[PDB]
Amino acid sequence: SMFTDWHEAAIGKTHNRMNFDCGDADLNQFLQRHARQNHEKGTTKTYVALDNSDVTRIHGFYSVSPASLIYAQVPGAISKGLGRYDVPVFRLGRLAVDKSMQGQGLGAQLLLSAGKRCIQAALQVGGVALLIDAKNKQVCDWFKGFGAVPLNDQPLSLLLSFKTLYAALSASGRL
Amino acid sequence: SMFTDWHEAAIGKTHNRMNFDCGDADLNQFLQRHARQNHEKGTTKTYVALDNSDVTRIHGFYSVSPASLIYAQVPGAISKGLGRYDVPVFRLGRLAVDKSMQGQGLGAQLLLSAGKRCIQAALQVGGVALLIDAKNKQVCDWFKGFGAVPLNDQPLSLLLSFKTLYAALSASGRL
Amino acid sequence: SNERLSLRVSTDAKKLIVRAAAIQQTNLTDFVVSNILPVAQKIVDAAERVYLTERDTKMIMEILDNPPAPNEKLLAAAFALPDM
Amino acid sequence: ERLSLRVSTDAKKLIVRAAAIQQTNLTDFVVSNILPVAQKIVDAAERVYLTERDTKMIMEILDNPPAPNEKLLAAAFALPDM
DNA sequence: TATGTACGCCTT
DNA sequence: AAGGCGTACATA
Ligand SMILES: CC(C)(COP(=O)(O)OP(=O)(O)OC[C@H]1O[C@@H](n2cnc3c(N)ncnc32)[C@H](O)[C@@H]1OP(=O)(O)O)[C@@H](O)C(=O)NCCC(=O)NCCS
Ligand SMILES: CC(C)(COP(=O)(O)OP(=O)(O)OC[C@H]1O[C@@H](n2cnc3c(N)ncnc32)[C@H](O)[C@@H]1OP(=O)(O)O)[C@@H](O)C(=O)NCCC(=O)NCCS
Ligand SMILES: [Ba+2]
Ligand SMILES: [Ba+2]
Numbered sequence: 001s002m003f004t005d006w007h008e009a010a011i012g013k014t015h016n017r018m019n020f021d022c023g024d025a026d027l028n029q030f031l032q033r034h035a036r037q038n039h040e041k042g043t044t045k046t047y048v049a050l051d052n053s054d055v056t057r058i059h060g061f062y063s064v065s066p067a068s069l070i071y072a073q074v075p076g077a078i079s080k081g082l083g084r085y086d087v088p089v090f091r092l093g094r095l096a097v098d099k100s101m102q103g104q105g106l107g108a109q110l111l112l113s114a115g116k117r118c119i120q121a122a123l124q125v126g127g128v129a130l131l132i133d134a135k136n137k138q139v140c141d142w143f144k145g146f147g148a149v150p151l152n153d154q155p156l157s158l159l160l161s162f163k164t165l166y167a168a169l170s171a172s173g174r175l
Numbered sequence: 176s177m178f179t180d181w182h183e184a185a186i187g188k189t190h191n192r193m194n195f196d197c198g199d200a201d202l203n204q205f206l207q208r209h210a211r212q213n214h215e216k217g218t219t220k221t222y223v224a225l226d227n228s229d230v231t232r233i234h235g236f237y238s239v240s241p242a243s244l245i246y247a248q249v250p251g252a253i254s255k256g257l258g259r260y261d262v263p264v265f266r267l268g269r270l271a272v273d274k275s276m277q278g279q280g281l282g283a284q285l286l287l288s289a290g291k292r293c294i295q296a297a298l299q300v301g302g303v304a305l306l307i308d309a310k311n312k313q314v315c316d317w318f319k320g321f322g323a324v325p326l327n328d329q330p331l332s333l334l335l336s337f338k339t340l341y342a343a344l345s346a347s348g349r350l
Numbered sequence: 351s352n353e354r355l356s357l358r359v360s361t362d363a364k365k366l367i368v369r370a371a372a373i374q375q376t377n378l379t380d381f382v383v384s385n386i387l388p389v390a391q392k393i394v395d396a397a398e399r400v401y402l403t404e405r406d407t408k409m410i411m412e413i414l415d416n417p418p419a420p421n422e423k424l425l426a427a428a429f430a431l432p433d434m
Numbered sequence: 435e436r437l438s439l440r441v442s443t444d445a446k447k448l449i450v451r452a453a454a455i456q457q458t459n460l461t462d463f464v465v466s467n468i469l470p471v472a473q474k475i476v477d478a479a480e481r482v483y484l485t486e487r488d489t490k491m492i493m494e495i496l497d498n499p500p501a502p503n504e505k506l507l508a509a510a511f512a513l514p515d516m
Numbered sequence: 517t518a519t520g521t522a523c524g525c526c527t528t
Numbered sequence: 529a530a531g532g533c534g535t536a537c538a539t540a
């Protein structure tokens with residue numbers, strides 16, 4: 001069923017990026033050429049699912065960065081209580097599985113793993129939701145299957161609340 | 176000594192604001208002519224402690240508003256993990272207790288009350304701590320008694336994290 | 351990502367702004383926006399932002415990473431707090 | 435590379451005078467001040483401007499979030515303890 | 517009814 | 529491809 005024989009780590013010098021191919025040119029290029037520079041020197045962080053036997057083999061990765069939702073003025077909100085102009089979220093910008101491991105539920109686990117990582121970080125820096133970047137309708141439909149909700153405008157973006165994610169991780173005992 | 180025969184409300188029409196005197200003119204003046212307008216038009220929300228017997232009598236009040244801490248360029252912290260540079264907090268900008276009952280622990284309870292309200296709002300708009308403005312060193316020392324930590328390069332401002340306040344609130348069953 | 355803006359102003363005010371735009375050797379938009387954005391950001395900053403030094407950044411990052419336990423005064427207040 | 439710019443006489447003189455006040459030459463002054471600005475801009479969190487309709491929807495989702503469904507829960511229980 | 521948002525034209 | 533102007537229509 002679901003492949004569970006992997007562990008997570010921040011991308012480092014040890015990991016075998018060149019052997020990683022997910023069938024999408026741009027995601028491959030990010031992991032192979034840009035992930036490490038952005039991780040060590042920037043706000044975009046990249047985490048890889050590593051095989052448990054050969055611990056340099058990348059089965060997949062996701063990248064996350066900080067973002068803010070700027071609410072528009074809406075009738076009734078000011079009275080409704082405390083608000084904020086810029087609501088903090090984490091953008092799940094990239095999520096990819098190696099072709100040799102697709103169809104085994106690793107994509108779904110990486111999404112929960114990105115949620116877990118963002119909730120834990122949000123405890124120290126703020127955040128209420130994952131904002132998810134979908135390449136196309138098919139990817140969007142895939143994320144929607146997990147309960148992410150597409151934005152009406154800028155429709156290749158979905159929102160998955162930390163509350164929803166937290167309930168799932170709590171129940172399983174991961175948080 | 177902890178007075179508990181009071182209840183919290185958002186500032187309203189029926190509350191006698193002119194009887195309130197805490198020994199500070201600005202706080203008194205803010206409550207009398209400004210607290211109301213900002214509460215339903217602006218960003219600062221004001222909540223009043225009201226006597227259970229005389230529901231129009233104000234024993235005290237506090238005002239809270241969203242703010243952000245802008246972190247500086249700290250070495251070795253970029254790569255340290257998932258983070259962001261604008262960290263949401265809530266500012267406890269005003270806290271006052273009517274002179275008729277200073278010394279009965281209402282101020283400490285309004286502090287906990289403010290932390291609870293902000294923790295709840297932070298579930299929807301983000302937030303990790305209370306940022307407390309003290310008007311002088313005595314007030315600042317008072318807040319430090321509850322575990323708030325003064326800023327080094329901004330004394331008179333203190334930070335009280337939501338984890339500390341949550342730990343107190345859950346322990347007493349208020350959250 | 352572009353927008354637009356339209357301010358009804360008085361006729362005498364417009365002469366002022368053109369002469370000042372002229373003396374500054376720029377066009378109307380440049381003068382108005384380059385002078386109003388600094389005022390605007392200074393306003394949101396003082397209201398909604400606290401710019402931390404490196405020392406306070408490192409202090410606060412430590413607090414938020416490992417926050418102190420609630421103390422006796424904070425607990426006494428939490429147990430006093432009534433729930434309605 | 436190089437930065438080639440056309441600046442008014444009043445602007446050039448003001449940069450010259452300030453560089454002078456700062457006991458530093460004209461290249462280190464402009465450059466040493468503008469990278470920290472530039473660094474702050476690129477490290478800042480991306481801003482996502484919502485329409486009115488999306489604000490309403492997002493506020494409602496953050497107010498009343500949906501429960502985790504079967505696919506999310508299944509993924510959660512498969513997730514390894516790291 | 518008084519902004520402010522919108523049509524837009526038109527050169528630079 | 530933007531600094532400007534004209535001018536009617538959507539909102540407290
Ligand atoms: C999408 C992806 C991450 C899923 O990884 P996965 O491990 O296949 O995800 P799971 O195995 O957990 O569930 C995948 C299921 O949905 C289907 N699916 C996933 N993405 C799909 C897509 N883009 N189009 C069509 N079907 C898709 C798979 O066929 C599979 O069906 P099954 O598992 O029911 O047999 C993976 O296919 C991938 O790496 N795609 C390239 C990365 C990518 O497209 N990223 C887009 C945003 S960065
Ligand atoms: C700070 C304040 C809220 C405390 O109210 P409280 O919680 O009811 O006071 P406490 O129960 O904490 O006990 C405070 C101690 O100092 C004393 N005290 C309280 N307020 C005092 C005052 N305004 N002047 C002098 N002594 C005071 C109390 O009698 C007690 O003394 P004890 O140590 O002998 O018991 C109250 O002083 C006040 O409203 N001051 C107005 C100005 C202000 O609050 N500024 C803060 C925003 S910067
Ligand atoms: Ba491969
Ligand atoms: Ba009185």
